[model samples]
Target: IVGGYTCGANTVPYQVSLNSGYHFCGGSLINSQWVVSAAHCYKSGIQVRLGEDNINVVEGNEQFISASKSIVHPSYNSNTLNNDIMLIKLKSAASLNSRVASISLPTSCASAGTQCLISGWGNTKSSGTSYPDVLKCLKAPILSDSSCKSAYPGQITSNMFCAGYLEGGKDSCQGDSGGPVVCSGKLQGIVSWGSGCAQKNKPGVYTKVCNYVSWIKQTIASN
Candidate 1:
């Protein structure tokens, strides 16, 4: 799955149904034929659901294009979460429209103190690990870059970003990994690691979108 903690931690956010259910994490339609998601989401039996909150609730606009192939960063390491990114090329591109859309990736990083929206259907509570039927999202401000660096100690690398409450609650948890952490209508990061779902000391860590821009573009080009 998503987090480095569990094998299935990076699992998708599904709409739960008997037929054709579940949204496989949040992804970006970076190109006409490409959907960008986390490497963990590109697992077998997984498909990307777009333009809807509930896979089961939403009709007409919902579509599932089979994944032609998944290209996870060759350097990705689960232990340290290095190069934690992946892209799925849909068998064919979904038609471009307002309802179905591609999220724009940030060409540049945001300055510290920017507020962002973290969205997912991850487990609502800490103890019971499960997914919600409807996708749920919350607002979180980007922590000061220096604060994150200090909080995580030497672990905070240039490729990583940190956010959440310092008072010790509210965060992206198990199933939230690999989803988008959007700020200012641009995808700023990918949910990567955190201590607990919403615990005090542990805020969420994400893959910095701006830092990986070249890698993302080049990889998409090659594949």
Candidate 2:
């Protein structure tokens, strides 16, 4: 849940769970058969679960599909967390309906102060072992590059962006990586990494989706 509150069952229909053996990360359905997530979440045996609101029980509309292909960005760096984005191709296209849909991608980079929404099933605290049974959501504002650089120093880069509160108490945590960060109804970022969950002045860092639009287009077009 990532320091977030419980969301409505149908709030974010594009939300999908990636299970690499177990619930490890969240992803966004970018198309009927394609999902975008953090490259850090890439694994060999991954599965996608859509139309899901709760993880404890199976819902009637839930669709589980095995991953057919996972293409992580060629320049992805685990050490620096750069280019932390990937595309997952599902075995079959998801049936879109009221309970399931795809999110729009941003045409431009998110600006500072832009309010955004982040949702996931991660722990509510950094030290907590318990995960939420239901999905959770929270709103945060984007931070300027200068502001983000001040907090992260040499860590912030062009491929990444920062969003959250300086006072903390509301930010993405572990298990929330690869989740969507929707700004103005379009996907602007993918949760990548952070110092710790909800720490004051330590906003969550994300892969800037707008920076990879051309790559995403080319990858999806080729495959």
Candidate 3:
């Protein structure tokens, strides 16, 4: 299961702001020039604050990257909450520093039960206050398709993965979308969706990061 978050030159987490400055979400830096996050986060305006201990504002070596072009998965369905993902093409590269770092990605198949750590600025309680500044993290095991289906029924698809507990004490909520779900020291998933806040037996879901390796590399290389 996920636990003990790290933030530095190699393990920094990405955070984003939305809704006239009252919302916060997490993201992951794939390269100095690009980051991978949920598509829903970019609906308003695109702004990335890299390597911050806080989410309410940007800090230390943080890069404010604007989306020159944003690409969300074509199959993304907001209604079904299927394939809810997106990529941001930063207008420029971020500075490499202690507080700012890039994460390695899994090049092979990321299977079920992968122990991944996720960090975010989501609400402390479901339907509660979205905590500012404090970077909260929790542990969750990767849920197998069968187990996920058992809980979510027809909601989970092959393109998505689930995490967190069925009891729902700790899980991603409204403001935690679009963050990194890191496992085995590699990028494995991006925070995507969850059913109605953080309900028990209704875990949070994420976009499979390994599934989009090609698009990520190609996009970074081109940009």
Best by TM-score: 2
lDDT of 3 by residue, 101-181 (tens): 778878775677777777776666675563545566766788877767888777777778888777776676766788878
Task: Give lDDT tens digits, candidate 1, residues 25-70.
Answer: 6666665677666665546655666555554565555666767778
lDDT of each: 0.66, 0.91, 0.68
Clashes of each: 11, 2, 4
TM-score of each: 0.83, 0.97, 0.85
Q: Measured by TM-score, how close is model 1 to the native structure?
A: 0.83
Cα displacement (angstroms), candidate 2, residue 161, comes to 0.9
Ranking by lDDT: 2, 3, 1
Give me the overall lDDT of model 2.
Answer: 0.91
Summing lDDT over every window of 10 consecutive residues in candidate 2, give the lowest-scoring window: 125-134
List the lowest-lDDT window of 10 residues for candidate 3: 1-10
**lDDT for residue 164 in candidate 3, whole number 0-100:** 76
lDDT of 1 at 126: 55
Candidate 3 structure, TM-score to reference: 0.85
Candidate 3: misplaced stretches above 4 Å? 1-23, 57-59
Runs of candidate 2 with Cα error greater than 4 angstroms are: none
